Scaffold this active site. Structure first.
Site, mmCIF file in Angstrom:
data_model
loop_
_atom_site.group_PDB
_atom_site.id
_atom_site.type_symbol
_atom_site.label_atom_id
_atom_site.label_comp_id
_atom_site.label_asym_id
_atom_site.label_seq_id
_atom_site.Cartn_x
_atom_site.Cartn_y
_atom_site.Cartn_z
ATOM 1 C CB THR A 1 -6.027 9.235 0.352
ATOM 2 O OG1 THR A 1 -4.966 9.084 1.311
ATOM 3 C CG2 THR A 1 -5.959 8.094 -0.650
ATOM 4 C CG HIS B 1 -2.129 0.856 1.093
ATOM 5 N ND1 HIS B 1 -2.223 1.885 0.181
ATOM 6 C CD2 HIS B 1 -3.312 0.829 1.754
ATOM 7 C CE1 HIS B 1 -3.410 2.456 0.284
ATOM 8 N NE2 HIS B 1 -4.091 1.834 1.230
#
Length: 591
Positions: free
Chosen positions: A431, A317
């Protein structure tokens, strides 16, 4: 139009106005505080705004003056690379390839054949990227950042004593040469081979030769040293185990770098997870768990192949978010549908070199580390609870509110929730946090449980909750959220040796979810028939991910067994009931 032609045109990640961010923060702590705690927090926020925060904010603006994305590097280190816990299990995201919904249902004996086509399509996508033929993502006519696509291939994390690093070897044709080999892990062993031959990409028949070769060879032989299992360890232990492995043989590094630079790692498993359009949660479990002996957790993209012809992915990730993987997974899914899951081209198999085995030099120490690695990963993963089901007013907002109501009903209290908001409108934008547990959502949840509440009351309040969440998602995705902003202020201080501001020490800061304390860690995985999941953010928390289809909702949920309060299956059941009541509340309240 070329894939990355708009990158130099993207706007800088913005820095929200201080007052705006603090106001949004104050509003977000309300659901978790009483009069007194709120007064204290409000006082703390006002002083911060007038003194230290104002100064830290100014410094943040100066950082942005010199960086098209002031957050990028910090986020990478603080959210991923500096974290020491085993990332493979606790951070990597995983998801099954949806090919078993049509042409490739679970079936023994199809591993190698289907595998050959999986590699073929995956490799055609890479060619699309290298030639910059991949379509630029756009919002209307506004281009979105495409940088994360560079992390899909030839990208790998390397453990560090205190901080890991990301090696990105991918390059477009216009930039230079890109590694052209893939790495295959089988029976605790590693192999590699070039995907090109005489200038062109090898075909499925040729890929089937390589895989069959590797599979048969290792099948009737004892498992190898399983050096790969070390990638599933605690970050510092892995870094040290890695240095030791290298000192034993300067060549062990070359082998590591071959795996690191490979377009991607392909893993061959002997397990067979029960996978059917209905029930397939077992695929998530074997993906997150499985046998570390053939998984390279540091790889940004590790394609996993099971015995019953099922496939899956496990990705780091750190370098990028899930959407890139969702895109290639979907691309492959379309290819499988168009070809009916078959290769209908030439059956000829040219004379291409056989896969070379990467034989690492090891000793009793290394072997003990490998053995320890497997044990800790298997043990840790064994405590994972997964619930995956299909359920047959914005859809995303709908599911978020449904989750709020579900958690509220199941646990008797509002659950602080984290929902991912993408900020790809901006250069290298990744994000932002959307805090779904709003005052509006809580008020609606109470009315839903209030016997004296009318249908009109509940509908009116549910709608108010939708409006708030929609505005929230819009602002966050547009760079007006506040979670990254506050993190930026904190990092400005620390980076200069200045003390941590009292605002972050305030009990309500972490109770509201700050500092990675959300009991509900969530994200929409798109509308491309692909699904994924990650473990909870906190021990007593949940992981809730989902994707939307025109006729159904698919969800994947995780929780820890060691926590008696949480139960993934029960929460999923609760949200399905939630969807119902929410729907009925609209129909019944038609008038």
């Amino acid at each position: 139009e070329r894939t990355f032609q708009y990158q130099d045109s993207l706007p800088s990640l913005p820095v929200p106005a201080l007052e705006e961010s603090l106001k949004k923060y104050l509003e977000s702590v309300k659901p978790f505080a009483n009069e007194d705690e709120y007064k204290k927090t409000e006082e703390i926020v006002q002083k911060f705004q007038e003194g230290a925060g104002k100064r830290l904010h100014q410094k943040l603006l100066e950082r942005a003056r010199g960086k098209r994305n002031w957050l990028e590097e910090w986020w990478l280190n603080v959210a991923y690379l500096d974290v020491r816990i085993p990332s493979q299990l606790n951070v990597n995201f995983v998801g099954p390839c949806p090919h078993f919904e049509h042409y490739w249902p679970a079936r023994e004996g199809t591993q190698l054949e289907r595998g050959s086509m999986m590699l073929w399509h995956n490799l055609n996508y890479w060619q699309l990227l290298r030639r910059e033929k991949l379509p630029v993502h756009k919002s209307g006519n506004t281009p979105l950042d495409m940088n994360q696509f560079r992390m899909l291939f030839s990208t790998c994390k390397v453990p560090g004593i205190t901080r890991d690093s990301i090696m990105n070897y991918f390059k477009t044709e216009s930039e230079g040469h890109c590694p052209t080999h893939i790495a295959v892990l089988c029976r605790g062993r590693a192999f590699v081979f070039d995907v090109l031959h005489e200038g062109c990409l090898i075909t499925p028949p040729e890929l089937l030769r390589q895989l069959t070769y590797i599979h048969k060879k290792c099948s009737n032989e004892p498992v190898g040293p399983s050096i790969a299992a070390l990638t599933s360890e605690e970050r510092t232990r892995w870094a040290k185990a890695r240095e030791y492995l290298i000192s034993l043989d300067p060549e062990n590094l070359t082998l590591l770098e071959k795996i690191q630079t490979s377009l991607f790692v392909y893993s061959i498993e002997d397990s067979s997870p029960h996978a059917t359009p209905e029930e397939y949660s077992q695929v998530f479990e074997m993906l997150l768990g499985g046998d570390p002996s053939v998984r390279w957790g540091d790889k940004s993209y590790n394609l996993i192949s099971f015995a019953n012809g099922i496939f899956g992915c496990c990705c780091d990730h750190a370098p990028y978010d899930a959407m890139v993987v969702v895109n290639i997974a979907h691309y492959v899914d379309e290819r499988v549908l168009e070809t009916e899951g078959r290769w209908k081209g030439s059956e000829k198999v040219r004379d291409i070199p056989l896969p070379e085995e990467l034989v690492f030099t090891v000793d009793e120490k290394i072997l003990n580390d490998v053995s320890q690695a497997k044990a800790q990963h298997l043990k840790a993963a064994s405590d994972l609870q997964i619930a995956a089901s299909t359920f047959t007013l914005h859809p995303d907002t709908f599911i978020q509110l449904a989750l709020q109501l579900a958690y509220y009903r199941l646990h008797g209290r509002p659950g602080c929730c984290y929902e991912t908001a993408m900020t790809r409108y901006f250069y290298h934008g990744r994000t932002e946090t959307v805090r779904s547990c709003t005052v509006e959502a809580v008020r609606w949840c109470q009315s839903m449980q209030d016997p004296s509440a009318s249908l009109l009351e509940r509908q009116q309040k549910m709608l108010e909750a939708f409006a708030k969440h929609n505005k929230m998602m819009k602002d966050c995705s547009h760079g007006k959220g506040f979670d990254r902003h506050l993190l930026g202020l904190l990092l400005i201080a620390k980076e200069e040796g200045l003390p941590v501001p009292e605002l972050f020490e305030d009990p309500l800061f972490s109770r509201s979810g700050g500092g990675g304390n959300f009991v509900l860690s969530t994200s929409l995985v798109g509308y491309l028939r692909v699904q994924g999941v990650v473990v909870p953010m906190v021990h007593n928390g949940y992981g809730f991910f989902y994707h939307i289809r025109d006729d159904r909702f698919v969800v994947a949920c995780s929780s820890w067994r060691s926590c008696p309060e949480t139960d993934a299956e029960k929460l999923v059941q609760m949200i399905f009931h939630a969807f119902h009541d929410m729907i009925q509340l609209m129909n019944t309240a038609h008038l």
